[PDB]
Amino acid sequence: SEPYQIDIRRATNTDAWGPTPKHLAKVLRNRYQVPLYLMTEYTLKRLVDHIATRPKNLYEKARKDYVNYGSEWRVVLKCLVVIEFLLLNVDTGDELNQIRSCLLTHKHILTREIAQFKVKFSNDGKMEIHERGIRKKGELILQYLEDSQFLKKERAKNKKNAL
């Protein structure tokens, strides 16, 4: 119910389209009122909660109600897009360190859950490409955490057309 949470939810909704540049900018502007640690943590919690809501097998698939069935992969991918966007766009020092500390605290999400991610079913038959997309985004985030110099340069490149 907090404003930053509504913004993150908009950016990471189950809709087929988005996030737009404006959605991401809106999430980012919460840094003037909310710590980056919390923005990062809520993004991870949404990611985890939407991974957990999926059925394990056909028995539970048929018996749990499961709104968003076959489109949960989108929330997962968009949450990773938000994390990548924050890493590239927040200020050096306090803001960036807060994101990184939150990700490191929960590093298993990247090193296990995302690394091993499977999309069993998606509504358009394209499970393979969605799975690949998610693992790739997870890989990029891990690279940013593993190689500070790469992250530093990408952040500098990201400013080239800032205005």
- 1-163 CATH fold: 1.25.40
Of 51, 43, 117, 131, nearest to 87 by C-alpha is 43
In whole angstroms, what is the distance from residue 120 CA to residue 98 CA? 34
Do residues 68 and 119 lie in contact, with contact meaning Cβ atoms separated by under 8 Å?
no
b/e map 68-86, b = 16+ CB within 10 Å: eeebbbbbbbbbbbbbbbb
Do residues 87 and 93 lie in contact, with contact meaning Cβ atoms separated by under 8 Å?
no
In whole angstroms, what is the distance from residue 130 CA to residue 25 CA? 25
Name the structure determination technique.
X-ray
In angstroms, this model's resolution equals: 1.8
In whole angstroms, what is the distance from residue 38 CA to residue 44 CA? 10
Secondary structure of residue 64 in the 3-state scheme? coil
Using CB atoms within 10 A of its CB, is residue 19 exposed (0-12), middle (13-18) or buried (19+)? buried
